[PDB]
Amino acid sequence: ESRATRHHLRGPKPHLLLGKLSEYSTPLSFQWLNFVRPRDIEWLDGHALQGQTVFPAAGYIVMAMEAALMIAGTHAKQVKLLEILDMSIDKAVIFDDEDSLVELNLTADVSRNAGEA
Amino acid sequence: AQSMYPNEPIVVVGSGCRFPGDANTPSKLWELLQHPRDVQSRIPKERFDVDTFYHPDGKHHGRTNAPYAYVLQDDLGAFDAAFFNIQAGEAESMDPQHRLLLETVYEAVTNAGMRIQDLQGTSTAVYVGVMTHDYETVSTRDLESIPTYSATGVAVSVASNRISYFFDWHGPSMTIDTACSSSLVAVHLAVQQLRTGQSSMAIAAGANLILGPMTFVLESKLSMLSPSGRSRMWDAGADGYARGEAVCSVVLKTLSQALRDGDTIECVIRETGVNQDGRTTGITMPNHSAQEALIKATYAQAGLDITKAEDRCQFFEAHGTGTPAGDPQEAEAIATAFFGHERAPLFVGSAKTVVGHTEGTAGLAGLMKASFAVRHGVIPPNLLFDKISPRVAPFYKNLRIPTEATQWPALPPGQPRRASVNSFGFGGTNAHAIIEEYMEPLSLPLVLSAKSQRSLKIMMEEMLQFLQSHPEIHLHDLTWSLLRKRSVLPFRRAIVGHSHETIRRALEDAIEDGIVSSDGQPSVLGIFTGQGAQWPGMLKNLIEASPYVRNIVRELDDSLQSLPEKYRPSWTLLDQFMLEGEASNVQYATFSQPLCCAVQIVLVRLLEAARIRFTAVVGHSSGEIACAFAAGLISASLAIRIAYLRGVASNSPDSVTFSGDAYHSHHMLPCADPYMQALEECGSVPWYSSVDAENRQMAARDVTAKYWKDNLVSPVLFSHAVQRAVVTHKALDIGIEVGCHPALKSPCVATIKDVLSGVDLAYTGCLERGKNDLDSFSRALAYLWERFGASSFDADEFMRAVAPDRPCMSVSKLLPAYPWDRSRRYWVESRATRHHLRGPKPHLLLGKLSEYSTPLSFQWLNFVRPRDIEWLDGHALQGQTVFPAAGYIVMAMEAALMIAGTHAKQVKLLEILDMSIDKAVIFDDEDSLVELNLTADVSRNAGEAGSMTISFKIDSCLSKEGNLSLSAKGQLALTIEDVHHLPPPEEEHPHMNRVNINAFYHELGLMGYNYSKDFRRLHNMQRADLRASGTLDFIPLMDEGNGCPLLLHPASLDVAFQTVIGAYSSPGDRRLRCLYVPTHVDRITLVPSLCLATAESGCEKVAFNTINTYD
Amino acid sequence: DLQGTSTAVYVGVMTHDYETVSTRDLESIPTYSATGVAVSVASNRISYFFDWHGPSMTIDTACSSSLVAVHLAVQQLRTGQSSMAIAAGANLILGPMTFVLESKLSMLSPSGRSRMW
């Protein structure tokens, strides 16, 4: 069992909006891998732009906040507050059809872990 | 005889091959084998970039030392899913092994001369040997993106089952896996399945494909593969086996079963034994004794004495994988089986030298080499054999590896050429097969069919090219093979032509037109043409081109001479008017009536020779007389005789053609009286009269002379007879205007449609107006075939009647293979999987970039062990080998380089800010793997501002038992461009006691810094005033897998760090009372251009200054 | 007694989670992974340990594999070439590969039990 393989067979639940944490993740660096298709996310059909189903920017924000929750849990921390700073939505995810799979990889790297602070 | 062997000799009747070197058919495979070429090539990036996995050391973690393989030159994703009734999603889900197995099995069935309909629903068995199922890993490495039909598409078993699923076979469908022997083992099982009699036919198939690095890495871990990339059988260069992509299918039958079915034979598998290696010196190690016992037992089962040369095999397709440990065992086994029990040698040659070691199908591959050879009497050579291996030399006394296409050794008369095939799978499952040569003790329409009209057009093009290439091939045999020995498919076309030129031009016309027909119906209605429709020179070509028609004409002449002397003979039109070149007009009753009668008699006899089941409706005048014969109650002789004697109508509800000032009128009424008076002394099929409206549609009432008189006297209700025939037999399928088309076409078809409301039953003419007789009849048969497949008529019986001499041969072997659509590439690749198979080189110190990386986020994954990094052994702390902090820094800088390259940026400057080494990577042993994952995320990409900020983290995991931890972290600030940057060094600090480098490193080791080799590269140093300077070797480091230098050899940077300690401590002072390791670097800053320039300059020795700022 | 005899082996294996779990991460793959996880070896190794020389097929006909092996073994026993024949079968749950693949076709029972008929 490569420790990546162990983290693959084992590991956290496939968190919604995030999928499974990458096998090569760390307490300091994480990469949740998912393949979102609208039919697998019942509510995602509601966000349509120009007819096409588009992953909401609020979706990216919720993904980031859930990643923050999972990171804090990894450090056994409870987040009293959760800011998202200088966030930018570069490319809207357009879903061709409700069964189309769009890969979302949320890579979150704790540049500062100052739980002492 | 060859069928008298103890166990019934199975027979290879056909084969389908997808072998490397463009060998997409057995003929091409044989040409390659007897004329080998350097087929092997670098693993195409279309399959997987092996350079992303290549490493000279085979045992290197996650690498393969064999970057070559005998790969197929075809797009394996290009598959005719529509042909096999497989949907796009399922076809993509399918293993390319399964798809190519389907294609090759269909090719083998075609070559054997079998229609899929004939085998459809039979008890045919399938035994597929597959070992290297890269699919079910490539398509499933990322569980996400796995298609719905992945389970069955990639399941190893389905490889066989799906075949039988498509062909509607009910025999056993094993998918065997005995490693390299798998396919051959399958043959054995197939052979057994054929010797039980439960399966009249058995596909023995094999499939090995190169779709992922899994197999390469696994085999190279054991050094099984050949780093040179070629399976040098029994050669001194033996260093493993080169993987090869091959999909083979072989149709096997019992010799008696094949002969009774009239299938052309490729070879005779006399016996196929399977044995296993005992507890050899290792699971992978083959056993010479086991293989010798296998050969001896197989020959004994075949009834062959191994000691006798007559019972011996002159050729031996050896396993011949090029393994230094396995090849000697095989040579010893061969020598001790065929010799060592006491003068041409016993030729030994492995196909894997030419097409590579194709693992699962390897056995079958060898079988093919043994098959074609034994069939062609040529011992194919071995491409890679330059010097006999010293280990194989002792057993090479009685053996000779052919380096040239050698003619078969002389044999005793009556003894078939005999070859042997050996395939040993790692684990030791050895399969041995004994093969032999089979001792072998007017034309039909050229029919083509495909599952798509595009495929049918490509078939027409390929057949035209084949005819141009092979004008020598008999047209009769070609058409008979295309009809009886080739599968019928939804989209159909038929080509009409008497000779090669005619058929080629008709094929050209069909190709230009593009008109084809789409989608047990031999029911035809015989509509018989009458006087007034006869064309000049009818049957002239048929009579002068078909001896069967000539014999029929002789019978007609005999009937003519049987007339009463008053009317004996009505001058023979068969030899006066049915003449080529003359084409004299025939309107005279004395000739026109018997001429049409003979035309229709000959045509109906030909149709019955094709076993066409008839319903009969009479026409007028001759159309009646001939129809009387078609009823199965009146002899043809009587019909033609009555027509000659007579020599001397309501066609449809909308058509009436009563004629006068002539027949059906008083003009011929008087002559009918004496004629009938002569007919009184002169003479099974549903048959309906029309001359007599209703009463004489019965068997017994149609023989009266008054009916033959009414033939010309009474009015003809042809429409009523057609109505009766088509309403009493609503199941009727087609109608044929026997004789002079198109006289009765329009009214007859209109009557059929009217009686059967809206039922536009097919209509066909067989002798057109002024057209070639052979072409006319062949076009009639072509229409019949295009309408009702092979069930329309039987070509075998037709050629049994027509041209009994030279029975048609199943030339399906030489016919072009089916032109698989290949338009759409059905493949599965998660973009992570694509980045895995593909992607950048495995950068040293970094490994492979993570599959889920981005231009903005990257994660290089590696498993560093000191022996795989030769220099890494030099950095030892407290004896343990420890990954240098300089190692982490160089990893970060190389990651910065790769990131800049990803953005097409050249780094003018590369700072590392606030770097921290959190956990030193301790290597327990030089072979211990420590996982290093460098995750670098460009928090700022301001190439517009010329900057790039990248937070980087080298996470480390010492052992797979533990979790992934942080080894180092920091930031990278890259000053970049779309393609003196640092302060000049201080003034070479003036006075510095010359630090004895040997003493310096001795003290460092005393304090736990056991630096060695590359990390003792500090050429000279001198320290004073809390400072040090000197010169350290800027030793270059380059990635052999990439062929380019790195920014820094971590040894040089670690020596630079040691300079800080030197400034802090002199040799022999012991100011370094504890082992300090770099924990937090405030700012490194490297000029990559200058570092690379120094590395490539060759000086590799650079000066340095250093301040021990805090001490 | 069986050591060195012509005993055959016919193993039915369909669900080789190993060769995927142990090879999902090509790094950390052990040296003997090739033969250790190769489907064929499943049979061969048996005969290798017991020093058997009979056929050592590793069959895969999906759920029928092992029974098919029996048939082959039966045939191998009716030829007289093997005084004995192991008919074996092996299905193990070591990775999610098989579960995900089968559930993609809904082959598996969500209730978790094969409710026959």
Residue numbers in the entry:
A (entry chain A): 939 to 1055
B (entry chain B): 2 to 343, 353 to 451, 471 to 548, 555 to 683, 723 to 735, 761 to 782, 794 to 1089, 1100 to 1231
C (entry chain A): 119 to 235
Can you list sentences taken from the study reporting this PDB entry?
The first isolable intermediate of the lovastatin biosynthetic pathway, dihydromonacolin L (DML), is constructed by the highly reducing iterative polyketide synthase (HR-iPKS) LovB, which partners with LovC, an enoyl reductase that acts in trans. In LovB, the β-ketoacyl synthase (KS), malonyl-acetyl transferase (MAT), dehydratase (DH), methyltransferase (CMeT), acyl carrier protein (ACP), and ketoreductase (KR) domains are active, except for the enoyl reductase (ER) domain. LovB terminates with a condensation (CON) domain commonly found in nonribosomal peptide synthetases. In DML biosynthesis by LovB, the initiation and elongation of the intermediate chain are carried out by the KS, MAT, and ACP domains. ß-Ketoacyl modification cycles are also repeated, but the tailoring domain usage during each iteration is highly programmed and permutative.
In this work, we determine the structures of LovB at 2.91 Å and the LovBC complex at 3.60 Å resolution using cryo-electron microscopy. The resolution of the maps enabled us to reliably assign the individual domains, dissect their linker junctions and finally build the atomic models of LovB. The α, β-hydrolase core domain and ferredoxin-like subdomain contained MAT domain have conserved S656, R681, and H763 active site residues, compared with DEBS and mFAS (r.m.s deviation of 1.89 Å and 1.67 Å, respectively). The KS domain adopts an αβαβα structure and contains the conserved C181, H320, and H367 active site residues with r.m.s deviation of 1.57 Å and 1.81 Å, respectively, to DEBS and mFAS. Despite the common fold shared by the KS domains, the substrate tunnels in the KS domains of LovB show differences from those of mFAS and DEBS, highlighted by the disconnection of the PPant pocket from the acyl pocket, possibly due to the hydrophobic interaction of the residue F436 with M132. The NADPH-dependent KR domain adopts the typical Rossmann fold, which belongs to the SDRs (short-chain dehydrogenases/reductases) family. The NADPH binding pocket with bound NADP+ nicotinamide ring can be clearly identified. Each DH monomer of LovB adopts a pseudodimeric hot-dog fold and harbors the conserved active site residues H985, D1174, and Q1178, which are contributed by both hot-dog folds. The S-adenosyl-methionine (SAM)-dependent CMeT domain comprises two subdomains and resembles the homologous modPKS CurJ (r.m.s deviation of 2.39 Å). The ψER adopts the medium-chain dehydrogenases/reductases MDR fold dimer. It lacks the active site residues, and the substrate tunnel is disrupted, leaving no space for substrate and NADP+ cofactor binding.
